[PDB]
Design a protein around this ligand. Structure first.
Ligand code: FBP
Ligand code: FBP
Ligand code: K
Ligand code: MN
Ligand code: MN
Ligand code: MN
Lengths: 501, 483, 506, 514
């Protein structure tokens, strides 16, 4: 029915979704969700990627978090057909600026007159004193320069710049060690601080699967993340976070060099006017779709759930619209790191996505994507679009790719099939990183290779099919599109066959 | 370029939204703000008008008759304070929001504990409750944040809060209080009735009947707030002047995951029929407490504009919060950016295509005017309208150029805010002897108000729409004039 | 016409769907022996001729003065009823730089047969200009032996005779056949350097102005400067004359875009064009130019061999029927007749056929796609006239307007409306007799010459003209009671001030 | 090349047709040529093959059984003369064109190759009287359909010779029709007559037609163009007559009159494809309307994915002159641009003085026209319209086409047993050539019925190991491909094949580089 655009819309509430939701969900790990038991709960509810937010907590503290995710995850390895892998994502600290330690709450008051970088004063913070961890602030913020504290809920205007006389423009309840922002001011603060490099090495050492790299402003920024990531970490997927004007202006350059993007609406939402983020968001998602790289929508999607068990009408709506925009993943932060309803937040994102996903007008979408996408000569894309097409023609229940590094699956999702892309792979990491791609569902294949190749292929396909039935992707009578390669290894995907279940 | 000038597809389109492309243009989506303690003061009202309020909502769920007579007295007072300058005067509509069949509750409720409906005792003003909630029947309290199975979800309960009984069905659309309320409305010349809990054609019939003879002029916007309302939408729409997607109630009556569908569907259908549609509730909540909205709220506003909504609302945000003006400014600012992001191309084509042939000279002139507008990047379309009807016809098609509507009907100049992209001008002079001349004076009036407010500058082309003889229903001419 | 796609569209063409509507592609007929008679002309006017073509490749000045005298005479024979009077334009077709064979050996009407596989000499020799035989033809383009290489083709007589170059050029007869006196010679792939404007051409053009022809079809136009000359020659007395450039060879095709910019319109001269370039390729040339012209909003004419067999037979072949329809469906503003009406035994019948095919093809147009497509492609504009025009078209579609009635002084406003291809008829009222003629060059326009002297009060003059259009409208069966009509007019008298659109009921 | 710059719209598209854009690619519209005195000679046939003929039409309106057995003997002989190199052998179909319920005048008075003039305003007599079978003259035409005198009423019109001659019947009578000539002209022997508006009780299948059809089977013709098809049941008969020995024969229904046009949808469903017989059609219905009939049927055929043939007078003047008129050139192109799968030649190759030259021209026009198709719109349009399907073969097919577009595939190489898979591919109108490899000689012939398919007959005996047999065939296709200039080093090709041997198991698409 619902599947013009107007027309489409007009035909969208009792049409029960039916299908693996495909927008994968990223949840940040924190006190509210570090416990193996809680993690297991969140896995059941639909978390696919676990975010470690390195703005907080020590190395040891995160090694615990990983230890636990890994623990919660493997607790299901008891049935290979049902095992959901889970990716792990290191979110980098980058050039944050932050206030000192005071869970007491100093009230900064509208109009009252001091930002200091004096070591001694590094905890002497008061109703009239706030100290900040970026010495250069006193040199980069001119008279009538605006300073923001805590998610931009606090505003100060610089009025006298020896030791920053500011006046509180927007006051509020200030807490411990909070994000500071200096828009219109050029931060010479480096993309890669020593801590960031340590943090990244840690990452590799512990085999995280994805680096969400904060404050990416330019191609060279992701180069560093790569260098730091070092040789041991070429497999790591680097997702550039876009969080400020420059990032937005150099987006095209950033996208080219990165594996994907995150629309970091939090910072972005203070660095540029609030009325504008939507544009930035819808724009980068578009461009990303066009290039066929993962894009992540983030921050405050479900805030009030930090405190309440139900989201607001806007948050529901936000989630839907991100999916309808084309986002590959959606995220949770405060919602799962500190709040009183982490599992319930995950369940909600899972539920909205499934409805939003059923409302996509693939028609327009696939045509649009086909149309825009330039010719290509790489057999893999060729097979991929070929597969998608066959998939539409017959309402394929699913497309089952054999993939070594996920790259073939990615190519399929690029074109947004409606049929599920069931990816079979022996690379445990690949099976994790692929959650970065809308509509892909990884299956980790454990058996050792058969002697005769073909047979190995057949075993894997049949493996996918079997896991398929078990999980209710495919039922007898369905047609399935199978995509595979002429010889073993990666980069040789080149075959599409049409099989009946 | 500006206003998102820099496509052939929607994808393409999206890919070219630019963040430095300064919006430039009267925002079109009109803003509704609910009046309450945070905003009943003449001075505060003046502030909100400057920020962009166009409709004032009186929420009859709360406060007495006298208390609202005060609010109207004030809105009127704030508004007329600008009548010092006819070229600049912004009318403001007044909308009565009906109480309808609510259920309400003068401590923390703990998860797992028993709570009796009549710390563990809550009394309710719907007696039939004990008769319609069976064993396993869910009872929700306060904005659906508190849950009760005949306590599932705990939380802080306050005094007299919304109660909902989903899956359960009897309470009349029109209670005696509602009728009094409506009479009050007519008596005080409200311009619009947002009618709560509309579930079926006959429901709006009553609102009309109650509204009585003295109130045929009153526009009746039906609030959709529950399953039934959603299922009978097509019938309700036919009979109503337009719609409100009441996401609050709706968002408890049906699963939360689903409202977006309801919303995008109704807005589509309304667009199709050319009736105003209003998006409402929680668009900017956190601003009830904080001076800045969350990234989701920003996003919500834009997407309602981009969905097609004619008006967007504010409730807690302007009735009780600490940042009413600041909430209005925000809606105004989002709308303007979302409006420059509309892909009129697809939109107009889509509307044209879908709209059936017609034979009414007015529609004919209208679509023609729009088309001319596009061809030249008209700065604006200037209609002379008696009841607004011709301005409405123009907006139907979603010109990008502004629809400047000149009218002597003060009320029409108000009710027209219900229509995306229209900008009313109330014309005060007495008629000229020679007709034509009267026409010319009005057009020129519109033009002059036009320059003054920065809709049109020298060199612009404007599309003028008028009628062959005086009275309504005779719109039938389109002229192309240069400024 | 209400289908969502072109495929769909096609699939719903109905053979019992009687056309109903003024055909809109105007027809151009060449005047010759078969059609110089006032009586025959009157017949052809009734049948639907709109433009009369005088082919200056043939006959003397006196001979054409007679043709014009006659057309004018046939035409004015109907001035007895202003409401019905069909103007008819007159078009001078230029001789330009031809190349021709001689007078056959002892015979200004006799026939030599050129045999397949035989040797033939082509000479440039003054003496031989009359000495044409079975192994010998002479030609009046001396440079030929210098521009045609070994293994180069020479086509003779409409391209029906063919020579390959293997004091004179040694040629094998590729394609043989019966050759007569003084016939056209073509050298494809070869470059010609003969002037666009020969002395004769200039005299011819002056003649044109002198006699008030309305249109110059200018032959062999290869480049912007070529139309400049035609304009210069046309002289001051002739600014009003519309110059339609004829595209007839490779160069013309390659410089099309420049030619188009400088011309009032185009003719796809498929005859010459169809020898200068390979035959397989003309369709491309034709469909391309018509597209481009549509885009620019200038008249484009499709011409030559549309109905040949009718020169001899009373019924066209299945291909010719097909050719006509496709030309209309391509977007051509006018279609032409030549041999068909100049010499053949069925001139009137040929005109009737073009009139009949066009009407069906016109009802098969998928305006939807067309108007959208035109809208879409047309750039913004700021000229009140275009603005009013597209606005009028749009209103027209919305209500299935029976017609659009423009008041136009130089035809310009009517042209703008047709640019967008309304389905409703464009009824143009004008006092300029010449404009009322030249407008036929614009698909879907129907001119009405208004004769009354101006009223004192302006407005009233306007009202009289509109009402004039209406009345002529009912009388001719364009509009009936109950119809809506879209009226386009101006705020003050003069040209270039069109700026109002009203919607009126009949 | 291939009109690559020629775009977001159709208008745009048109505006970019470039005359120096040399076509480059097998032409895909196959060409049908009627065999006749001008072209029965083995040598002439060989010439026509080289020029591009793909299907040979035997017109059973004329000549005896023996005369056609000769024509077939010859085509076959011309064709097999090239079997000397399997990589370049062009199969050629053979099509029996049925006589059906035609009506005809007699031989002319002692003038077999003579003529009579029928004069405007005079009295002609139509006689069914056998005695005057051959006694025709300026005032007398005898006709071979007896009932004519019981079916053409007073005031009823009779057309003779391609509609160029016209009689109005004014007096009915005990020995024939007393006509007044409404259109006159030079009449020849045994020419077709049409009774429009007058309904012809003449059977679709006359005894002769049945014999004719049996002959067909007996001699293994590949295609029956069935004349005057008016209704589903008409093709049933052709099938019945065709008998068991002839299920393989493709039956193309000729649409030649009003009824045919009105029942088209029913006829299409039951037939393997269609011919728009514009000759008859063009007299039975007004001439101004044929174009509509033609564009409509071709559209519908495209939609259903059945071959559609455009026919009659496409190049007439070439019967007499070595060069076609500007309209005929144009007619050919528009038929291809309309979507026609095959184009035909009749007079042009049966009798005229330039049969080869006529074939060459159609070949040359088609190639240019084929580079002008706006596949974009076309494939979208086809996709869009085509309903979901569940048959692996269609699925593979559309998918192959799509891959083809994505990379500008030089070709699609299918392995097909009965041609079915190749047909499914053309259905979607790829731009890339559909090279079909098959061991069925017949299939290789019948596939010419399908736009853009180029059959290759594979001769080697099967390999022991399947797969290897597959690989040999693909490689066979490739090799024939390079040799004929379809594919060059560096190209991508899309290969379509099956999981097991036999027909109906096509289900794999691979992407290979050359
Ligand atoms: O990592 P990629 O580039 O997606 O490769 C997918 C690969 O998976 C396969 O289907 C099977 O790979 P393996 O047998 O090496 O595990 C290959 O044919 C193909 O190269
Ligand atoms: O209110 P509506 O229905 O849009 O009517 C618009 C009317 O405005 C006019 O332009 C002027 O009306 P008035 O002179 O009464 O103000 C009329 O021509 C037309 O009928
Ligand atoms: K000439
Ligand atoms: Mn951030
Ligand atoms: Mn409510
Ligand atoms: Mn010429």
């Amino acid at each position: 029915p619902a599947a013009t655009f107007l027309e489409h819309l007009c035909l969208l509430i009792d049409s029960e979704p039916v299908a693996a939701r495909s927008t994968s969900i990223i949840a940040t790990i924190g006190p509210a969700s570090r416990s193996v038991e809680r993690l297991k709960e969140m896995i059941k509810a639909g978390m696919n990627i676990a975010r470690l937010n390195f703005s907080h907590g020590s190395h040891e503290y995160h090694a615990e978090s990983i230890a636990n995710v890994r623990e919660a995850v493997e607790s299901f390895a008891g049935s290979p057909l049902s095992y959901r892998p889970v990716a792990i994502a290191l979110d980098t600290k980058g050039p944050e600026i932050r206030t000192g330690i005071l869970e007491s709450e100093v009230e900064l008051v509208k109009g009252s007159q001091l930002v200091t970088v004096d070591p001694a004063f590094r905890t002497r913070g008061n109703a009239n004193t706030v100290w900040v961890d970026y010495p250069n602030i006193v040199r980069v913020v001119p008279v009538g320069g605006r300073i923001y504290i805590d998610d931009g809920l606090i505003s100060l205007v610089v009025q006298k710049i020896p030791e920053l006389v500011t006046q509180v423009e927007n006051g509020g309840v200030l807490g411990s060690r909070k994000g500071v922002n200096l828009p219109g001011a050029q931060v010479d603060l480096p993309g890669l601080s020593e801590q960031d490099v340590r943090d990244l090495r840690f990452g590799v050492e512990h085999g995280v699967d994805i680096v969400f790299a904060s404050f990416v402003r330019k191609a060279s920024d992701v180069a560093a993340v790569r260098a730091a990531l070092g040789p041991e970490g070429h497999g790591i997927k680097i997702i550039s976070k876009i969080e400020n004007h420059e990032g937005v202006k150099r987006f095209d350059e950033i996208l080219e060099v990165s594996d994907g993007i995150m629309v970091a609406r939090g910072d972005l939402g203070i660095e540029i006017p609030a009325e504008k983020v939507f544009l930035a968001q819808k724009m980068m998602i578009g461009r990303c779709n066009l290039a066929g790289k993962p894009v992540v929508c983030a921050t405050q999607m479900l805030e009030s759930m930090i405190t309440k068990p139900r989201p607001t009408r806007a948050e529901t709506s936000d989630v839907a619209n991100a999916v309808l925009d084309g986002a590959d993943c959606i995220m949770l932060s405060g919602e799962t790191a500190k709040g009183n309803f982490p599992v319930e937040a995950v369940k909600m994102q899972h539920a909205i996505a499934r409805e939003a996903e059923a409302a996509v007008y693939h028609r327009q979408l696939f045509e649009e994507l086909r149309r825009a996408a330039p010719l290509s000569r790489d057999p893999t894309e060729v097979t991929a679009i070929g597969a998608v097409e066959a998939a539409f023609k017959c309402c394929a229940a699913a497309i089952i790719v054999l993939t070594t590094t996920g790259h073939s699956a990615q190519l399929l999702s690029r074109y947004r099939p409606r049929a599920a892309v069931i990816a079979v792979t022996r690379s445990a990491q690949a099976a994790r990183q692929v959650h970065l791609c809308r509509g892909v569902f990884p299956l980790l294949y454990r058996e050792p290779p058969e002697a005769i190749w073909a047979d190995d292929v057949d075993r894997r396909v049949q493996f996918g099919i079997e896991s398929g039935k078990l999980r209710g992707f495919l039922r007898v009578g369905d047609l399935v599109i199978v995509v595979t390669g002429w010889r073993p290894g990666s980069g040789y995907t080149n075959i599409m066959r049409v099989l009946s279940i």
